[PDB]
Amino acid sequence: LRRFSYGQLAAATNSFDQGNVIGSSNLSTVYKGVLGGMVVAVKRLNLEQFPSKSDKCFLTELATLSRLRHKNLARVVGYAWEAGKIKALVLDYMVNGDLDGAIHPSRWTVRERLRVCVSVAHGLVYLHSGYDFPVVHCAVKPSNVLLDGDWEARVSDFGTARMLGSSAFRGTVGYMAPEFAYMRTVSTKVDVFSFGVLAMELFTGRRPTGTIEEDGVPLTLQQLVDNAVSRGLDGVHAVLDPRMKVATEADLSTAADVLAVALSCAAFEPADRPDMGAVLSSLLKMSK
């Protein structure tokens, strides 16, 4: 874990040039950087506008990601830490962006989307049981999945991780387990729920914002998928991402099987959700 100064990260990012910005939120701006010639992502927290939340997310991500290692996780190269001036994570640069941009001839066939599901599941199995304590990510969603130069997926953004020991919901809320959204209850099952929602979005092309129907009742993405799956393969076909090639019986059948796993992941009661190892097992069986 290398420590960097402001001047080093300024030089690496061409004085934090607007043209080097590869990601953005209220809390951080992510820049492409080049250090000996190593290409990196510089995630710079918004100290000036949100000092307290910046500090919490910075410390959480640094403490968590510095102790973890797995091929389907983002990798921390180092950090800068100068109170009032800069707090930043230096991460391995993922040249193919994030899954949200990938979703929203196309390479994203059914088999390739299933491969991403398997890669993310490996990352989450590692988080939940590969380290000395369970780590709950708490913000699993496509914009927190990065893509390699080999298009290998990696779980990123540990600013909300916990170590144990029109639309109905907009923004982030649609990915959140009800007990986490309403009560801030944290268990590995909240990642399982978010994984299910992610798979649903990956295969339908739909953000989990849901819709409020004319009688005022919300139709969640889970309920939409549940209705489609219950109507068989033709029901599933009607709900799949229209930009995705679905021509063979095998591709439709695989998509149907992912959505059925995704529905178990996104069950309302945490105790009815599988653990990620069981999820991974189902996805590995479908991969053969």
Length of the chain in terms of residues written: 288
DSSP 8-state symbol, 176: S
Provide the β-strand partners of residue 154. Answer: 146
Quick check: helix, strand or coil at residue 228? helix
Q: Which is nearer to Mg ion, 146 or 229 (CB)?
A: 146
Assess contact for 60 and 161: CB atoms under 8 A.
yes
Residue of 72, 144, 220, 282 that binds ligand ADP (CB under 6 A): 144
Is residue 28 a contact residue for ligand ADP (CB under 6 A)?
yes
The amino acid sitting at 238 is A
* Closest distance to ligand ADP from the beta carbon of 146 (Å): 5
- How far apart, in whole angstroms, are the C-alpha atoms of residue 219 and residue 228? 13
What are the Cα distances from residue 262, in Å, to 24, 136, 234, 257, 285? 29, 18, 18, 9, 15
Q: How many chain residues bind Mg ion (CB under 5 A)? A: 2
Of residues 159, 196, 208, 210, which one binds ligand ADP by CB under 6 A? 159
Residue 154 belongs to what H/E stretch?
strand 153-155
**Between 92 and 226, CB nearer to ligand ADP:** 92
73: partner contacted, choices ligand ADP, Mg ion, none (Cβ within 5-8 A by kind): none
Q: Are 119 and 109 in contact (CB under 8 A)?
A: no
Half-sphere exposure of 169 (CA within 13 A, CB side): 19
15, 25, 223, 227: residue in contact with ligand ADP (rule CB under 6 A): 25
Q: How far is the CB of 140 from ligand ADP (least distance, A)?
A: 11
Whole-number minimum distance, CB 150 to ligand ADP, in Å? 14
Contact 160, 57 (CB under 8 A): yes
Closer Cβ to ligand ADP, 157 or 191, answer by number: 157
User: How far, in Å, CA of 66 to CA of 74, rounded?
Assistant: 10
Least spacing, CB of residue 74 vs ligand ADP, in Å:
6
Q: Does 22 bind ligand ADP (CB under 6 A)?
A: yes
Q: Is 58 in the site for ligand ADP (CB under 6 A)?
A: no
We find the least distance from the C-beta atom of residue 3 to Mg ion, in angstroms, to be: 22
Answer yes or no whether residue 159 interacts with Mg ion by CB under 5 A. yes
Position 20 contacts ligand ADP (CB under 6 A): no
Question: Which of the listed partners (Mg ion, ligand ADP, none) does 180 bind, with a CB threshold of 5 to 8 Å by partner kind?
Answer: none
Position with the least CB separation from ligand ADP: 23
Q: Residue 65: which of ligand ADP, Mg ion, none does it interact with, CB under 5 to 8 A by kind?
A: none
Q: What is the largest CA-CA distance in the chain?
A: 61
Whether the Cβ atoms of residue 169 and residue 156 lie closer than 8 Å to each other: no
By CB under 6 A, is residue 146 in contact with ligand ADP? yes
Question: By C-beta, is 154 or 273 nearer to ligand ADP?
Answer: 154
Tokens of 204: 């339908």
Segment (H or E) for 196: helix 188-204
Residues that bind ligand ADP (CB under 6 A): 22-23, 25, 27-28, 30, 41, 43, 74, 91-94, 97-98, 143-144, 146, 156-157, 159
